[PDB]
């Protein structure tokens, strides 16, 4: 380890002499208290260290020790059910050993070093292993955590620890070249974990919400952007997505949130229940929490820490949903760091490389073939919070250039008690065409046509808004009144979804397909009845209205019979009509 | 804030911190940064201004296992009434809502000149209701907001189309807006309990016809609707 | 126009005034349309009386 | 200006100084300042531009006991016709008023295209009035300014509501503004005495009702109001 002494202190900037051999962006311990800093410039025998925490009280001549490694995360058993800050320090153990305040220079381990894990070997002496292979398994809540050899490590197995209880520091496998492999390894957060091959967006990411799964789908391994306007129910929708998605592991990243909003996340999330097991949802999620008053380095590194953890869980063969609660706050942290570096800004004070960093974060998503030969995916749902909802902000423009879906959350819809408050007019998805074969194979060959028909009906309803504003709906022709009423039905019975209801919180693709079938069949029958001289108000009184309105709340296993009965009675109700 | 934290979390005090002018603080921060040869960020302010303001603001809150609390009311004058100025912008980024003073209300002789329409408390729902203030608080506030917005819009409409062309309910909203400004906002130096404020709000809502109160449940309407302003007001 | 911060604020105030004028004109249009729809029923009654 | 001061204050000459383009002077000043890395004002001009322009402009005037005088008429081209550009801004802050030309007036064939509203003379009050030009000069000037500004405002209103919707007072002010621009400002190369100019001004003011002339005292109105514009010509 390169060891030097402090030569100059100027705020968070420390110049350390005697540091020849220190590498750029290595983590350093500054002063007797061991404050963590990063090398950002090398000059002769000196190194420029940017200290994470406050440097008040430091004196010239205090030791500077280089760890020799860049910013990295420990990947191994013990991350699930854990809460970390932006640089992966366990907040609960920090509270245990320090109090209600976070003191400077506290040393904690990301993975617990005292807990014993039930090791089960899967390799034998003489076996040849490569990066990403499975050395063994360890139980962690409902999962079987696969211990992977690090991606850059290969060799022949010499000795394997038998089944038993060991800590993460115990060398379970040691290779012929003397390399010891433990239950965990470290990976730089700014280097993407290698994969064999990136797959195409063929399969959908099922969030359990009808509007998202049908109108604006995101592919497994895709990326979606959401806005967080106040009063839109963003937190309900985010935690509903966490509960009901088809992802095995959830990673939630809070980059520089408000103190009370971060408290809301940290209190509500442990109370969520996992429907797959009935236990706490926290048993399959990792929370990364940062408030606005934490060091800017941690707030900037939070998303990379989260995406690295997500990539590790993907490399174990799982499907991971990654949610970043505010990339706008992360961008603010990046802007502050660039300003501290005295870099010329681009547009509204942001560094010119803002789009490059956003792309480096978002492009780590995708369905891949892991180095171990299994299949895994990372799906990223990012959130943006412009100053006053003005999307023209460079962060939002940069995000929308690279994300495949945009779920426009609207406060006006939430004011009208339309939940989820997703404005279907401003939302879009680029994954529909790629996902169409999967829909035809897996739910119905008709499904894309039905989805386009429903979207066209919504567009026709939106095209009449100025007429309905100018004159009442009763002044509309029966054809226009029919599409207005069908748009109302579509909204209130397909688009709206109760996140707290016992059966309506989740909706499968087939149930949604049946609902659209019922709605479109009713619309076609009513359009025929209109040209049969039937007036609108007898159609609006049909019980099939209430039948379609109740289709949301019927359970999943009872839906097929309800759907066939409803189709039959919708066919019958219009035949008997005069 | 050091004194506030000490009191609240070592003696269980409920501490209210008032920071009288954060604009002066930010100008001092800019001057200090310039004096130390630092390159400024947006609009000449330090690039770390957001972090500094966060380290000030985020010292308030409630701690698990502690009876005390710290509440902050920062006060800042927007440099040109510009909400997009960096100081109010970053403050809104960090804080939970804002109370906006109205120059129009102030010049009309109303004190305190708080304008309810642009004001917002983001944590309000968590601190009101049954067992905290009263069960009808939230719905009353929503109804007041909607009725006041309706009244202020009808006030601009009446200038062009005249009072006689208005609907009867429009005239009711017009009278409600004036009474709301004169009695609810314009309280002077009075110290009003929450019960007195709710009573005045209900008396103001009673000027509207029953059933126009869409945001309020029928139980609360039956319990509190009907009373006149004359019976409970401080002065005519 | 000379680009200055004060001028920028003036233009933003003008934009706000224009938006409020649009809203006010829309409300006036709503009132006019209500009057027009009453008057059309009055006109149809008058036309029927003329036919008689 | 050294020559002008020498002549005026040593040989009692009345000197008129014309500086063709102070914009070109400020360009050279900016070149020197940028070569010297001076802390700039706005748009890259050196911070000491105000002081330098002051050392130039402040060399005019009259001196107690001496008979000569120095009168300065600098000329400067406002970049993009922007009055808030640093050069015209600092010049206006230093000089005793300015004569501002209007491109809109010029495009209409009016010469000299002097726009009176942005124009100013700080020393006007010292040289006009009873015993200097005429007793009604200042009041007539004030009334003309108010009436012309009213006409310009009504021109702005016309673009929104159309001319046919105007009242008779607004129409009278609009016609006053038009006739003012066409007859008072537009004079060509002819040399008008102050009496002729005041006669034209009173003829234009007679277009308005006698009660609208709030700026003018009633005795002056009785003396001069009522004359027709056709009597001067046509």
Swiss-Prot record, chain A:
Any one GO CC term of the record: proton-transporting ATP synthase complex
Enzyme class per UniProt: translocase
Residues holding ATP: 228-235
Enzyme nomenclature, EC number: 7.1.2.2
Keywords: ATP synthesis, ATP-binding, Hydrogen ion transport, Ion transport, Nucleotide-binding, Translocase, Transport
Annotated CDD domains: ATP-synt_V_A-type_alpha_C (cd18111), ATP-synt_V_A-type_alpha_N (cd18119), V_A-ATPase_A (cd01134)
GO molecular function terms listed in the Swiss-Prot or TrEMBL record: ATP binding; proton-transporting ATP synthase activity, rotational mechanism; proton-transporting ATPase activity, rotational mechanism
Key word Oxidoreductase present: no
Example of a GO biological process term: proton motive force-driven plasma membrane ATP synthesis
Entries under InterPro entries matching the protein: ATP-synt_VA_C, ATP-synth_a_Xtn, ATP_synth_asu-like_sf, ATPase_a/bsu_AS, ATPase_F1/V1/A1_a/bsu_N, ATPase_F1/V1/A1_a/bsu_N_sf, ATPase_F1/V1/A1_a/bsu_nucl-bd, ATPase_F1/V1_b/a_C
Domain of life of the organism encoding this protein: Bacteria
Function: Produces ATP from ADP in the presence of a proton gradient across the membrane. The V-type alpha chain is a catalytic subunit.
HAMAP family named among the record's database cross-references: ATP_synth_A_arch
Protein family per UniProt: Belongs to the ATPase alpha/beta chains family.
NCBIfam families for this protein: PRK04192.1 (NF003220)
Protein name as catalogued: V-type ATP synthase alpha chain
Lineage: Bacteria, Thermotogati, Deinococcota, Deinococci, Thermales
Gene: atpA
From Swiss-Prot, chain C:
Source taxon at top rank: Bacteria
TM annotation in the entry: none
Function as written in the Swiss-Prot or TrEMBL entry: Produces ATP from ADP in the presence of a proton gradient across the membrane.
Similarity annotation: Belongs to the V-ATPase D subunit family.
Protein name according to UniProt: V-type ATP synthase subunit D
Organism: Thermus thermophilus (strain ATCC 27634 / DSM 579 / HB8)
Lineage: Bacteria, Thermotogati, Deinococcota, Deinococci, Thermales
Curated annotation (Swiss-Prot), chain D:
Sequence intervals crossing the membrane: none
Function per UniProt: Produces ATP from ADP in the presence of a proton gradient across the membrane. The V-type beta chain is a regulatory subunit.
Protein name: V-type ATP synthase beta chain
Location of this fragment in the whole protein: 239 to 472 of 478
Gene symbol of the encoding locus: atpB
Protein species of origin: Thermus thermophilus (strain ATCC 27634 / DSM 579 / HB8)
Family from the record: Belongs to the ATPase alpha/beta chains family.
């Amino acid at each position: 380890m390169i060891q030097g002494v402090i030569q100059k202190i100027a705020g968070p900037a420390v110049i350390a002499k005697g540091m020849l051999g220190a590498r750029m962006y290595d983590i350093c311990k500054v002063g007797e208290e061991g404050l963590v800093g990063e090398i950002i410039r090398l000059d002769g025998d000196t190194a420029f260290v940017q200290v994470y925490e406050d440097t008040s009280g430091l004196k010239v001549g205090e030791p500077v020790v280089s760890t020799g490694l860049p910013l990295a995360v420990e990947l191994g058993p013990g991350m699930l059910n854990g809460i970390y800050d932006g640089i992966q320090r366990p907040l609960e153990r920090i509270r245990e050993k320090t109090g209600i305040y976070i003191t400077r220079g506290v040393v904690v381990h990301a993975l617990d070093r005292e807990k014993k894990w039930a090791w089960t070997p899967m390799v034998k002496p003489g076996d040849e292993v490569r990066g990403g292979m499975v050395l063994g398994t360890v139980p962690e809540f409902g999962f079987t955590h696969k211990i992977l050899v690090p991606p850059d490590v290969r060799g022949r197995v010499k000795e394997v620890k038998p089944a038993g209880e060991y800590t993460v520091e115990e060398p379970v496998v040691v290779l012929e070249d003397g390399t010891e492999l433990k239950m965990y390894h470290t990976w730089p957060v700014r280097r993407a974990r290698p994969v064999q091959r990136k797959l195409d967006p063929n399969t959908p990411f099922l969030t359990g919400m009808r509007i998202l799964d049908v109108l604006f789908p995101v592919a497994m391994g895709g990326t979606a952007a959401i806005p967080g306007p106040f009063g839109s129910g963003k937190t309900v929708t985010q935690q509903s997505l966490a509960k009901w998605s088809n992802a095995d592991v959830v990673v939630y990243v809070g980059c520089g949130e408000r103190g009370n909003e971060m408290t809301d996340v940290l209190v509500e999330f442990p109370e969520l229940t996992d429907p797959k097991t009935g236990g706490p949802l926290m048993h399959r999620t990792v929370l990364i929490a940062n408030t606005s008053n934490m060091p800017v380095a941690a707030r900037e590194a939070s998303i990379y820490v989260g995406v690295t953890i997500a990539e590790y869980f993907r490399d174990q063969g799982f499907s991971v949903a990654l949610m970043a609660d505010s990339t706008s706050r992360w961008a603010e942290a990046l802007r502050e760091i660039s300003s501290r570096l005295e870099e010329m800004p681009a547009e509204e004070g942001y560094p010119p490389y803002l789009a490059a960093r956003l792309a480096a974060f978002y492009e780590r998503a995708g369905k891949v073939i892991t180095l171990g030969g299994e299949e895994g995916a990372v799906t990223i749902v990012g959130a943006v919070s412009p100053p006053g909802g003005d999307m023209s902000e460079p962060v939002t423009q940069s995000t929308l250039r690279i994300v495949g879906a945009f779920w426009r959350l609207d406060a006006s819809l939430a004011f009208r008690r339309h939940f989820p408050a997703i404005n279907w007019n401003g939302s879009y998805s680029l994954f529909t065409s790629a996902l169409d074969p999967w829909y035809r194979e897996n739910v119905a060959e008709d499904y894309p046509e039905l989805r386009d028909a429903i979207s066209e009906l919504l567009q026709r309803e939106a095209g009449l808004q100025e007429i309905v504003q100018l004159v009442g709906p009763d002044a509309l022709q029966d054809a226009e009144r029919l599409v207005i009423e069908v748009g109302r039905i579509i909204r209130e019975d397909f688009l709206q979804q109760n996140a707290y209801h016992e059966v309506d919180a989740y909706c499968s693709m087939k149930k949604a397909y049946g609902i659209m079938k019922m709605i479109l069949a009713f619309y076609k029958e009513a359009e025929a009845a209109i040209k049969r001289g039937v007036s609108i108000d007898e159609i609006l009184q049909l019980p099939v209205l209430e039948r379609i309105g109740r289709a949301r709340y019927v359970s999943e296993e009872e839906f097929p019979a309800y759907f066939e009965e409803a189709m039959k009675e919708i066919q019958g109700a219009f035949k008997a009509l005069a | 804030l050091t004194v506030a934290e000490y009191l609240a979390f070592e003696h269980d005090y409920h501490v209210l911190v008032i920071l009288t002018d954060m604009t002066n603080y930010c100008e001092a921060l800019r001057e200090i940064g310039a004096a130390r040869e630092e390159i400024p960020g947006r609009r000449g302010y330090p690039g770390y201004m957001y972090t500094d303001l966060a380290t000030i603001y985020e010292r308030a809150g409630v701690v698990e296992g502690k009876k005390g609390s710290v509440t902050q009311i920062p006060i800042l004058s927007m440099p040109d009434d510009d909400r997009t100025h960096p100081i109010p912008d970053l403050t809104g980024y960090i804080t939970e809502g804002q109370i906006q003073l109205s120059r129009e209300l102030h010049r009309k002789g109303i004190y305190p000149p708080i304008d309810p329409l642009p004001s917002l408390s983001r944590l309000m729902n968590n601190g009101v209701g049954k067992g905290k203030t009263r069960e009808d608080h939230k719905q009353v506030s929503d109804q007041l907001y909607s009725a006041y917005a309706n009244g202020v819009d009808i006030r601009k409409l009446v200038a062009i189309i005249g009072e006689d062309a208005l609907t009867e309910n429009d005239r009711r909203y017009l009278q409600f807006a004036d009474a709301f400004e004169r009695f609810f906002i314009n309280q002077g130096q009075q110290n009003r309990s929450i019960e007195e404020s709710l009573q005045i709000a209900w008396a103001l809502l009673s000027m509207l016809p029953q059933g126009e109160l869409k945001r309020i449940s029928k139980d609360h309407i039956g319990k509190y609707y009907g009373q006149k302003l004359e019976e409970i007001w401080g002065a005519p | 126009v000379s680009p200055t911060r004060m001028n920028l604020l003036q233009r933003r105030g003008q934009l706000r005034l224009a938006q409020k004028g649009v809203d006010l004109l829309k409300k006036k249009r709503d009132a006019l349309v209500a009057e027009f729809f009453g008057l059309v029923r009055e006109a149809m009654e008058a036309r029927k009386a003329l036919d008689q």
